[PDB]
Amino acid sequence: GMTEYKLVVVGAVGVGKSALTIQLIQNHFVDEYDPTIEDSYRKQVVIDGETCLLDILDTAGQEEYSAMRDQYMRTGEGFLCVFAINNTKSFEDIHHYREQIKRVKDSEDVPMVLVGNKSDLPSRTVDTKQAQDLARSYGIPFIETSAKTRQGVDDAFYTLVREIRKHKEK
Ligand SMILES: Nc1nc2c(ncn2[C@@H]2O[C@H](COP(=O)(O)OP(=O)(O)O)[C@@H](O)[C@H]2O)c(=O)[nH]1
Ligand SMILES: Nc1cccc(NS(=O)(=O)c2ccc(F)cc2)n1
Ligand SMILES: [Mg+2]
């Protein structure tokens, strides 16, 4: 079979995880998607000449059993850590997602990309510089996205695939 990359999109409720995933897979912006629904989505794509399968888990936070959360973190190969540029709390939450994923995977080398979503909104409480400072500290890429206009969306997911490839070649 072609290579499949298991990606997981994490972050506070309301940041745009669903809107980002649906833009990537279906190429439309979704206004309202129930905040409590967690699903995975597949799309065949071509990234730097490689035909491959993205299998994206759009998370929604607490699970019926914590074992479920630990199971998708161990299965996931790379994680998009999303905050919204107008929600400082969602940015502060990134610390806990970075920690938790490394802790479950018991790894210091987990492919991740920091994503600051809703870049189309003039309303902003998290400046680019602050998010760059966090990404520099983690040694991972940082991309600002808009699920609404699609700006940065392919970049965020494809950069994550590229981080996964760097990890695999070691
Ligand atoms: N303006 C704008 N609104 C967005 C963006 N992404 C998501 N939203 C809206 O923010 C709200 C939460 O988005 P959703 O995808 O459900 O967030 P989730 O809880 O992380 O899955 C919804 O009303 C979306 O329409 C974006 O990039 N720009
Ligand atoms: N695309 C991905 C990424 C990580 C996990 C999965 N699927 S999975 O390991 O069966 C899974 C495990 C626990 C869940 F709550 C949801 C999905 N898919
Ligand atoms: Mg959602």
In the structure encoding, which two tokens stand for residue 115, read together? 């994503």
CA 59 to chain centroid, in Å, comes to 10
d(CA 26, CA 127) in angstroms, rounded, equals: 29
Top mutation candidate among 10, 22, 146, 155 for ligand 1, by most atoms within 8 Å of CB: 146
In this structure, what are the phi and psi dihedrals at residue 142, rounded to the nearest 5 degrees?
A: -130, 130
Yes or no: say if 21 and 147 are a contact pair by the CB < 8 Å rule: no
Strands 4-10 and 78-84: parallel
Alpha-carbon gap, residue 44 to 67, rounded angstroms = 29
The 10 Å Cβ neighbour count of residue 130 is: 14
Whole-angstrom Cα distance, residue 5 to residue 52? Answer: 8
**Token code pair at residue 130:** 């602050």
Question: Which residue has the least CA distance to atom 11 on ligand 1?
Answer: 14
**To test the ligand 2 pocket, which listed residue (71, 74, 80) has its Cβ within 8 A of the most ligand atoms?**
71
Q: Which amino acid is at 13?
A: V
- Encode the chain in three state secondary structure: CCCEEEEEEECCCCCCHHHHHHHHHHCCCCCCCCCCCCEEEEEEEEECCEEEEEEEEECCCCCCCHHHHHHHHHHCCEEEEEEECCCHHHHHHHHHHHHHHHHHHCCCCCCEEEEEECCCCCCCCCCHHHHHHHHHHHCCCEEECCCCCCCCHHHHHHHHHHHHHHHHCC
Burial of 153 (0-12, 13-18, 19+ CB in 10 A): buried
Kindly state which CATH superfamily the domain 1-170 is placed in: P-loop containing nucleotide triphosphate hydrolases (3.40.50.300)
Please give the number of the atom of ligand 1 that sits closest to the Cα of 33: 16
Between helix 17-26 and helix 153-168 the angle, nearest 10°, is: 90
Ligand 2 neighbour 78 (Cβ under 6 A): no
